[PDB]
Design a protein around this ligand. Structure first.
Ligand SMILES: CC(=O)NCC1(O)CCCC1
Ligand SMILES: [Zn+2]
Ligand SMILES: [Zn+2]
Length: 581
């Protein structure tokens, strides 16, 4: 408690020693409240005019238009689990780290790795303040003094400047220096692909939307019961102290300066948070707590994946009756769990596809559906079902939801079999029509649109409206202008190369589920979903407004060409059969 956080709080108390007050109408019961000073400020989503002008039929679809417009679960507290649960979680975490580290070496990430990261404009979610942008503070050795200072503080076992700014979400920013030190200690989890499928068997980190469908299908091929895919209710707010402690056991695989630094992040930022919060009543409240998730977007992913793999293995143990009760674990129930992990624990990881808080499990049989005592006690309460009502399974990998997607089996006119990702096309068009940020040029706007268009052509080519609208946007943006993206899966659509050539690389060449690597010569070799499948997943094919739009597409393309100016443009519409004269 208050020794570990006191320093961070005293430094802020003094930064605003003109303001300090212990207010009596503070709405925090779960969050420890320490005081407040004075402030006054707020990020609304803007519309991409290039994408909107080339998707006109969707101007009257509320599912699309509504997306463009527009904290009582973060004030909850999960009961510390039963003892038998704590034992199960501790034993499984131990085994899992060993498994994940069998062919990886934990290592410190570098200034030079973090420097290049912010320059190529990755999202690390920091605050703007001594410097301007993310890019400014990196080029300057007086910054890395402020970093150097903190780093030595962490080795000394204290912490001064590592404070969360708050603003089923609510993202926790940290000043860049704080994000560096996190990244230095734990960046290896992402950067060295600890949660690749090759390395973790359950994981899909860096597999890409074009491989996930194939991965669910290979899980389907295993003998067993239904595919379960239960979402947890507000998973970040359900991360117990015991989860943070079991996550910390990765430091047991570390050494030297690294081991101390990783230990510092876990003990001082994760297991003892300090957070500054705007309360429009506007002030800045300074609250603490020992539990819940609050890392950076990217480390959160890897740790969520870890704890999720752990819970689902344990839910599988309960379904297979490896243990009976969670109130306390016997010493034979210990050796039985242990014997299980050793004998079948790798086989059981390969029955799962886990991506942070999200999972699909094909358990050994359907007893799994009513194995709820361990899961509920770990605090990983399922969403939109009664706490003790059995999970409902899926009989068909092409119905399982995973990473906001479903997957179709699509058979090429030459018999080869693509497995393609999909979701409600209103979702895909509403997202493409949004440009997060202030002060975009017509050219930067146009280049974002082209990123979406190039993705549609790569991932969602089997949807008729998305192929046509992608050809239209790429016809309407200068052929040579480069795709952009302000918070960068595997993004092979981020290139100026011929898209049919990328398609052959991604779907034929680099695809391990394709045994015949015969290139595809033109876009008409590449099949669509069935017309009715396309309509089920939101297609406007058959509607009057869409038939007009398609017939008169070269007129919308020209409107955009005229707003941008006289530049060098390619016509891509002859790539489709109907427009090919
Ligand atoms: C949709 C489905 O097949 N099963 C999910 C639940 O288990 C049942 C309702 C919420 C969780
Ligand atoms: Zn610190
Ligand atoms: Zn679909």
């Amino acid at each position: 408690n208050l020794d570990i956080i006191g320093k961070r709080i005293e430094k802020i108390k003094q930064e605003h020693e003109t303001s300090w007050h212990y207010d009596q109408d503070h709405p925090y019961k779960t969050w420890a409240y320490h005081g407040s000073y004075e402030t006054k400020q707020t990020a609304s989503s803007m519309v991409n005019g290039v994408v909107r002008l080339l998707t006109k039929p969707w101007d009257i679809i509320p599912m699309v238009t509504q997306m463009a417009m527009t904290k009582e679960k973060v004030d909850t507290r999960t009961q510390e689990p039963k003892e038998g649960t704590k034992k199960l979680m501790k034993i499984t975490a131990e085994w899992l780290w060993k498994e994940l580290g069998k062919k990886k070496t934990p290592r410190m990430c570098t200034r030079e790795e973090f420097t290049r990261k912010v320059r190529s404009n990755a999202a690390l979610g920091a605050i703007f303040n001594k410097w301007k942008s993310a890019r400014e503070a990196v080029e300057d050795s007086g910054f890395w003094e402020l970093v150097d200072k903190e780093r030595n503080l962490h080795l000394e076992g204290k912490c001064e400047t590592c404070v969360y700014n708050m603003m089923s979400r609510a993202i926790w920013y940290m000043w860049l220096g704080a994000r560096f030190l996190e990244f230095e200690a734990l960046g290896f989890l992402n950067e060295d692909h600890w949660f690749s499928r090759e390395n973790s068997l359950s994981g899909v980190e860096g597999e890409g939307l074009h491989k996930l469908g194939y991965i669910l299908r290979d899980v389907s091929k295993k003998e067993g019961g239904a595919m379960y895919a239960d979402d947890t209710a507000g998973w970040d707010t359900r991360i117990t102290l015991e989860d943070l402690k079991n996550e910390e056991m990765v430091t047991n695989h570390m050494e030297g300066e690294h081991k101390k630094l990783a230990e510092a992040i876990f003990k001082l930022t994760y297991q003892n948070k300090v957070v500054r919060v705007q309360r429009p009543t506007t002030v800045m409240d300074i609250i603490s707590r020992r539990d819940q998730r609050g890392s950076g977007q990217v480390v959160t992913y890897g740790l969520n994946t870890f704890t999720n793999m752990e819970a689902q293995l344990i839910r599988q143990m309960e379904g297979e009756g490896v243990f009976k009760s969670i109130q306390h674990l016997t010493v034979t129930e210990e050796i039985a769990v242990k014997n299980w992990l050793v004998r079948v624990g790798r086989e059981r990881l390969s029955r799962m596809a886990i991506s942070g808080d999200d999972c699909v499990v094909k358990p050994l049989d359907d007893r799994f559906a009513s194995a709820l005592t361990a899961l509920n006690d770990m605090g990983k309460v399922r969403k939109d079902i009664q706490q003790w009502e059995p999970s409902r399974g899926w009989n068909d990998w092409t119905q399982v939801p995973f990473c906001s997607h479903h997957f179709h089996e699509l058979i090429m006119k030459d018999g080869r079999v693509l497995v393609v990702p999909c979701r409600n096309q209103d979702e895909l068009i509403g997202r493409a029509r949004i440009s997060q940020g202030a002060g975009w040029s017509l050219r930067e706007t146009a280049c974002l649109g082209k990123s979406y268009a190039q993705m549609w052509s790569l991932m969602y080519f089997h949807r008729r409206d998305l192929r046509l609208a992608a050809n239209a946007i790429c016809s309407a943006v200068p052929s040579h202008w480069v795709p952009t993206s302000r918070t960068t899966a595997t993004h092979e659509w981020m290139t100026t190369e011929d898209m049919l050539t990328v398609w052959n690389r991604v779907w034929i060449q680099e695809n391990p589920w394709m045994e015949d690597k015969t290139p595809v010569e033109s876009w008409e070799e590449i099949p669509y979903l069935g017309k009715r499948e396309d309509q089920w997943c939101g297609s406007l094919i058959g509607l009057t407004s869409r038939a007009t739009w398609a017939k008169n597409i070269q007129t919308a393309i020209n409107q955009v060409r005229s707003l941008i100016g006289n530049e060098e443009y390619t016509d891509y519409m002859p790539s489709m059969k109907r427009f090919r004269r």
